[PDB]
Write an enzyme that holds these catalytic residues in place. Structure first.
Site, short mmCIF file in Angstrom:
data_model
loop_
_atom_site.label_atom_id
_atom_site.label_comp_id
_atom_site.label_asym_id
_atom_site.label_seq_id
_atom_site.Cartn_x
_atom_site.Cartn_y
_atom_site.Cartn_z
N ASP A 39 0.88 -1.20 0.00
CA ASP A 39 0.00 0.00 0.00
C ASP A 39 0.91 1.24 0.00
O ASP A 39 1.95 1.22 -0.63
CB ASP A 39 -0.93 -0.06 1.22
N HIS A 69 -3.55 6.01 3.92
CA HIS A 69 -4.35 4.84 3.51
C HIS A 69 -3.73 3.54 4.01
O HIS A 69 -4.41 2.71 4.60
CB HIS A 69 -4.38 4.86 1.98
N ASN A 161 -14.32 0.10 -6.07
CA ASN A 161 -15.35 1.00 -5.54
C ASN A 161 -16.14 1.66 -6.66
O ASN A 161 -16.51 2.83 -6.54
CB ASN A 161 -14.69 2.10 -4.68
N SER A 224 -11.31 -0.99 0.18
CA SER A 224 -10.00 -0.98 0.79
C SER A 224 -10.06 -1.27 2.29
O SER A 224 -9.08 -1.77 2.88
CB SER A 224 -9.31 0.37 0.63
#
Ligand SMILES: [Ca+2]
Length: 279
Positions: A39, A69, A161, A224
């Site tokens: 990530d 994130h 998403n 996520s």
């Protein structure tokens, strides 16, 4: 063990009904397992990680998470307060820049890196990789995810998403990994969650409180956020000896809460991750 006033997603994965606020889990808590969070990085110094997190590889100038994130996702895997597997070891691989973007060649290199690096680490209960990222279909990205899974790592990936069929996104569309959709606290499919036959399982993804950079916390939403609940659940179940990296996704599906979710399109699994804990 029981964590009272837990974030809703942790409560939800330890209950057969929505609306509870206690997270029930075995005290082993993932100890002996390892989870790679691939990530934007992890703020390893956050007190919530208790020294159990470290950066092992970066593809940029710094190994710091300048975005947040990756620290959020890592927190849902394994932070003390916000994590599923509260004693797991977390390893950060920074394949995304501080804007949250990354080229597919870099993301592939990070997957090949984890397949090799896990051979240098003491993870007697097994290895998980959590990938809360993706973009448009790429056979090369799918192949890299399939290799990582084949090497003996339980791979969990976000469905995406776009409120669309995940068949058009990667690595979500790789059948051999564990593709995770998002639900909300009322047991609805999250409004943004991708769907489709390639999904394996749903986890909590709307309004998820976890760790953030600068030693902080915040609530954010996405597939996520659902992915690290499933990645942490796998580490937790592997530590208990219930399943292995090869079969964890199937075990999670078989033992899931079934038929509880609303707004699931025909052809998509109606399965919500569940730890089956009984005191
Ligand atoms: Ca799959």
């Amino acid at each position: 063990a029981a964590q009272t006033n837990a974030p809703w997603g942790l409560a939800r994965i330890s209950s057969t009904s929505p609306g509870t606020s206690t997270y029930y889990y075995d005290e082993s808590a993932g100890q002996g397992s390892c989870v790679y969070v691939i990530d934007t990085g992890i703020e390893a110094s956050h007190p919530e990680f208790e020294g159990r997190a470290q950066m092992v590889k970066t593809y940029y100038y710094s190994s710091r998470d300048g975005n947040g994130h990756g620290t959020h996702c890592a927190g849902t895997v394994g932070s003390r307060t916000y994590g599923v597997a509260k004693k797991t070891q977390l390893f950060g691989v920074k394949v995304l820049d501080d804007n949250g973007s990354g080229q597919y060649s870099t993301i592939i290199a990070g997957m090949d890196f984890v397949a090799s690096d896990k051979n240098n680490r003491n993870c007697p209960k097994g290895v998980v990789a959590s990938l809360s990222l993706g973009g448009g279909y790429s056979s090369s990205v799918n192949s890299a995810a399939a290799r990582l899974q084949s090497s003996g790592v339980m791979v969990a990936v976000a469905a995406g998403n776009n409120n669309a069929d995940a068949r058009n996104y990667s690595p979500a569309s790789e059948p051999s990994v564990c593709t995770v959709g998002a639900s909300d606290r009322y047991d609805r499919r999250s409004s943004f969650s991708n769907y489709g036959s390639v999904l394996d399982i749903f986890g909590p993804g709307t309004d998820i409180l976890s760790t953030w950079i600068g030693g902080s916390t915040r609530s954010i939403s996405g597939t996520s956020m659902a992915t690290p609940h499933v990645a942490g659940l796998a580490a937790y179940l592997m530590t208990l000896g219930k399943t292995t990296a090869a079969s964890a996704c199937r075990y999670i599906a078989d033992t899931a809460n079934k038929g509880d979710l609303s707004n699931i399109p025909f052809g998509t699994v109606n399965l919500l991750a569940y730890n089956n804990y009984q005191a």
